């Protein structure tokens, strides 16, 4: 199996920053972020290969969120710039090896809060 763990979550003021990071136990073909709004479905929010140099992004998020991995470590960051209130939700990582494209993913982390206000 492989694990896989989050951290950095948080409440940040809308304009602000943060920094999510990813562990996960092994090497894996690909890993990703997702998001999960109240109510709402889980949504892709940035992916990335462990060898090429594939990325994908969400619309909403483009030119604001950045995906990058550290393979020494086998952590998966994703910097998330501008924040504005309608990014608030649980963030997952997830990986596997699986097809880069596939639209379900085998092993999914813990998830952790992050809220944006306007306050
Ligand atoms: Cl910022
Ligand atoms: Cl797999
Ligand atoms: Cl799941
Ligand atoms: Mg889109």
């Known amino acids: 199996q492989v694990q896989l763990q989050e951290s950095g979550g948080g409440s940040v003021q809308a304009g602000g920053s943060l920094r999510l990071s990813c562990a996960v136990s092994?090497?894996?073909?690909?890993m990703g972020w997702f998001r999960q709004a109240p109510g709402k479905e889980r949504e892709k929010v940035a992916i990335?290969?462990?060898?090429?140099?594939?990325?994908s992004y969400a619309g909403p998020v483009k030119g604001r969120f950045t995906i990058s991995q550290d393979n020494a470590k086998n952590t998966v960051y994703l910097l998330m710039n501008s924040l504005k209130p309608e990014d608030t939700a649980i963030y997952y990582c997830?990986?596997?090896?699986?097809?880069?494209?596939?639209?379900?993913?085998?092993?999914w982390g813990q998830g952790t809060q992050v809220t944006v206000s306007s306050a």
């Open positions: 997830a990986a596997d090896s699986r097809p880069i494209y596939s639209g379900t993913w085998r092993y």
């Open positions: 092994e090497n894996t073909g690909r």
């Open positions: 990335i290969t462990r060898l090429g140099g594939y990325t």
